[PDB]
Amino acid sequence: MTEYKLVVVGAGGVGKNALTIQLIQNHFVDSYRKQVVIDGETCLLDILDMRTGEGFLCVFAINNTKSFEDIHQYREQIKRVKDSDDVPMVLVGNKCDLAARTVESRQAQDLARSYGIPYIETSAKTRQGVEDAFYTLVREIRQH
Numbered sequence: 001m002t003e004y005k006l007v008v009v010g011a012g013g014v015g016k017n018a019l020t021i022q023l024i025q026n027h028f029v030d031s032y033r034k035q036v037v038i039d040g041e042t043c044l045l046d047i048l049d050m051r052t053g054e055g056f057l058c059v060f061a062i063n064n065t066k067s068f069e070d071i072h073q074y075r076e077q078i079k080r081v082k083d084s085d086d087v088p089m090v091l092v093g094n095k096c097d098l099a100a101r102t103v104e105s106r107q108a109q110d111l112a113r114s115y116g117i118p119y120i121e122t123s124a125k126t127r128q129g130v131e132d133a134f135y136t137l138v139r140e141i142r143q144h
């Protein structure tokens, strides 16, 4: 059974933990391992948060401009650590259930395009896009 080691990075308070708990325990309110079938393949998702992960969720919150601006720092670190320019990763805009949006989707898309990675909006609260975020990351790992 294939095992994907996933890392979630981003400013504190963006919902990294909430996203993980929503994926694993299916609810909104230290490593994690969930067995799941993705595209017919039975696999094991190992969510840490580098050192060394196979895929990285770069998370910010759409109601938090600074967390968005900090994303670049996080990716640069990952690139240095992995000694590579092409690391499987997804840009995640969390808390999309909130009305106080200060980061437009277009902004994140442009950033993601510059990185050559997908952008997905999530809500650990409503569960919107959570599975899609992690699953999409796995599919990015499979292309690598």
Ligand SMILES: Nc1nc2c(ncn2[C@@H]2O[C@H](COP(=O)(O)OP(=O)(O)O)[C@@H](O)[C@H]2O)c(=O)[nH]1
Binding pocket: 010, 011, 012, 013, 014, 015, 016, 017, 018, 019, 029, 094, 095, 096, 097, 098, 122, 123, 124, 125, 126
């Ligand atoms: N409304 C809303 N709140 C969220 C969402 N994700 C996380 N939160 C809240 O944001 C706060 C900090 O989230 P947390 O997971 O601890 O951030 P972390 O530092 O990245 O782990 C908590 O009170 C969460 O309930 C979301 O998608 N929507």
Ligand SMILES: [Ca+2]
Binding pocket: 017
């Ligand atoms: Ca917390």
